[PDB]
Design a protein around this ligand. Structure first.
Ligand code: PLP
Ligand code: PLP
Lengths: 359, 359
């Protein structure tokens, strides 16, 4: 292929897992690979990290897809199970699960399983998304230690809502609540994801759950990159030019006549659009690398194409290599220029994009 | 349980192709199915419309995927071919192609094919994206009529840049240029897509290329839906609740503490996020249907989850049906609220979303 392609550096992936073990030296690793491993490929990303202590996924379907591909490490269902009839599979597949509601707990109480299941009680410490609230947590917790279907001890998990904002006391407050509930309880503790790992060493505890930074991308919007933490970028969104055309001063480009040229120039057309996952919101001027040289996007990003300004005697030609982000252009730079989160940029890509794996 | 799923109404798809034949009664139909048929499924959308005169795709890869699935109809390569070594496949697969540059034409000229290929010369009439400029078009055109590898006559294609803006004279100008070049030439003429079909009956000519409106979605940003033109919505982005929790006044929700509640209420958590293709940009208040009742999104949309405000004694529960858009809630209403183009909303979805076909 020469069009929409994501190149995944397996070497950078391994480097990052090891680099994260250096940053959180007393904690085991839950490699978070939900949403097709953040756009890098669920199964391939798991196979690249046979050293991971466990893998984290959002849904049951993702975990099963890992077992189907031969992945054997423990897989953590971060949101738990959505149907009580799933417990038998989860037990047999040796999936570890979070438990945040009455339905899940009552399911565990009355299920009949050939083996008990490892559980992580999800505690709501401030995010107010999933989890048992503090005032209901002690009773809920106690019921889990009385389950024959739950492998003792009951582990405790939680998640930060604003760890990337060190100046507000949100994280210290969640930590305060997390610590109060865990006092005197056995079982592993886990509350830190990318942000907690890098900015809060007092939240590492027993297990940390690296997601975005595992792929060498910073979880912060302070324009820092994965390299700020010694992590190497894994993904490169690439394509090729499918046309190099003459253009003249005063002439607009693309839908809505969004951009008008102030000079005679040459425009390049890239085989990349939002039908591939590239943000339609990308404003003119956003950087793209053409033949390893940065050129600006001019005009509205279409479903399948993107126009760039090369210059009046630019000698680039149809077929030449284009980098939307990757090697000489961090996805964080593209997130600042487009105002789109790096999390979304690397993850919200379509099945039209080819996948390459190197090293 | 059910999670992220796109339900495709085959009946509505059929209705729209027929409805468009009623709006452009003297023109053949090029069903545009590029980018996985605008998120509806490339092969299934083609199989639902065996009545289409032809199918349009962005890339050669998409056309070959159609032939692989048993689609037998003529397929139009809207951007042409990117490599001269592809002509033999194009010829053998009976793919019709656009020709916009020197490389493609020179390729046609010196290739040796067992059969000639049907071609549509792409003329740049104002969009300044792809196509031969007016002052180079006559010479370029004449070389195509002299090709033994091109099945005569040479057809002429072009595309509108601002057909959804009837008040600016952009479309009349492109039409003026298109008409001047086609004078005295045989061969089919085609310049109209969804907008040209609905708003410009002078631009129908021989072939019209319905894309977005084929799926029952309006190409305008004037709070018009597909129903404004008698077209029925084909896609329904659905999911289910995975939690219904108590929440209290003054408490924030989600990452960044984006939303704070002014009352004790109950929050629902949807198995839908941008890891599925749902816009991370969706602001609190964006409508979502829970049990066929509209509730607002509260807090930042995460990779796998979305929180909604149900009410203090709302009786919704984990497992209940959620509609992100579809029946009861047009994607155009979500586009207006989120400020994201309906084109991108239905198209930029990930492979995590399951596909259902009804009728
Ligand atoms: C997805 C998620 C993570 C990883 O988050 P990052 O910000 O990419 O580090 C960890 N834990 C939970 C509970 C999550 O849902
Ligand atoms: C995608 C495309 C279409 C369809 O346009 P809509 O506005 O979605 O109908 C038709 N023709 C060409 C050249 C295209 O690239």
């Amino acid at each position: 292929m020469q069009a929409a392609t994501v190149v995944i550096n397996r070497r950078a992936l391994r480097h990052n897992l090891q680099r994260l073990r250096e940053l959180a030296p007393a904690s085991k690793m839950v490699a978070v690979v939900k949403a097709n491993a953040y756009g890098h490929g669920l199964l391939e990303t798991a196979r690249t990290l046979p050293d991971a202590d466990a893998f984290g996924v959002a849904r049951l379907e993702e975990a099963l897809r890992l077992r189907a591909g031969g992945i054997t490490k423990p897989v953590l269902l971060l949101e738990g199970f959505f149907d009580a009839r799933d417990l038998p599979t989860i037990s047999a597949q040796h999936f570890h699960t979070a438990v945040h509601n009455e339905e899940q707990l009552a399911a565990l109480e009355e299920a009949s399983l050939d083996e008990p299941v490892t559980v992580w009680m999800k505690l709501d410490t401030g995010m107010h998304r999933l989890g048992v609230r503090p005032e209901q947590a002690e009773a809920f917790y106690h019921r889990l230690t009385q389950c024959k279907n739950v492998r003792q001890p009951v582990n405790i998990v939680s998640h930060f809502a604003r760890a990337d904002e060190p100046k507000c006391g949100a994280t210290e407050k969640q930590l305060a609540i997390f610590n109060t509930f865990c006092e005197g309880k056995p079982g592993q503790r886990s509350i830190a994801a990318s942000g907690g790992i890098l900015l809060w060493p007092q939240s590492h505890f027993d297990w940390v759950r690296p997601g975005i930074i595992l792929y060498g991308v910073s979880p912060l919007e302070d324009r820092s990159t994965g390299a700020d933490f010694g992590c190497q970028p894994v993904m490169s969104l690439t394509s090729s030019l499918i046309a190099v055309r003459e253009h003249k001063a005063g002439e607009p480009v693309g839908y809505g006549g969004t951009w008008v040229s102030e000079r005679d120039t040459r425009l390049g057309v890239v085989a990349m659009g939002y039908g591939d996952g590239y943000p339609r919101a990308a404003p003119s001027g956003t950087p793209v690398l053409v033949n390893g040289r940065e050129v600006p996007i001019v005009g509205r990003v279409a479903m399948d194409m993107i126009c760039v300004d090369l210059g009046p005697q630019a000698q680039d030609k149809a077929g030449d290599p284009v980098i939307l982000w990757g090697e000489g252009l961090p996805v964080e730079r593209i997130a600042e220029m487009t105002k789109v989160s790096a999390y979304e940029l690397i993850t919200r890509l379509t099945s039209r994009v080819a996948m390459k794996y190197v090293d």
